[PDB]
Write a protein that binds this ligand. Structure first.
Ligand SMILES: CC(=O)Nc1cccc(NC(C)=O)n1
Length: 113
């Protein structure tokens, strides 16, 4: 399928044990995709003070459409030193590895894969 229904665990930034996916734009987008497929991807909601606590490059999920079965359509956009790789809508949050942190909520998304 070109799109996949996912429920992402929403994590508090201070709980997150692995604060990014790797060391290059290409690696973080690769790792983010693999973790989304394997069900090992969490979401951190972006507010004042959140991003400086996480590791660059960042991977955002961004709203791609203005929501089948409650799942907001999103795509991946990476960021490194203020340059973004991709073009999309509003940030739903930043993706990180999920290694067993307890979530506060779930974000239903439909991912263009
Ligand atoms: C079934 C499933 O979850 N598939 C999935 C999810 C996220 C990513 C991908 N594959 C790619 C290439 O992004 N496949």
């Amino acid at each position: 399928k070109t799109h996949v229904q996912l429920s992402l665990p929403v994590l508090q930034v201070r709980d997150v044990l692995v604060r990014g996916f790797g060391d290059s734009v290409e690696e973080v987008l690769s790792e983010a995709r693999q973790h989304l497929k394997d069900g090992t991807c969490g979401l951190v909601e972006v507010e004042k003070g959140v991003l400086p606590q996480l590791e660059q490059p960042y991977v955002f999920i961004k709203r791609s459409d203005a929501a089948p079965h409650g799942h907001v359509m999103v795509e991946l956009v990476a960021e490194l030193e203020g340059i973004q790789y991709g073009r999309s809508g509003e940030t739903l949050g930043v993706l990180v590895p999920h290694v067993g942190e307890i979530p506060v909520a779930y974000r239903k998304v439909l991912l263009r894969k």
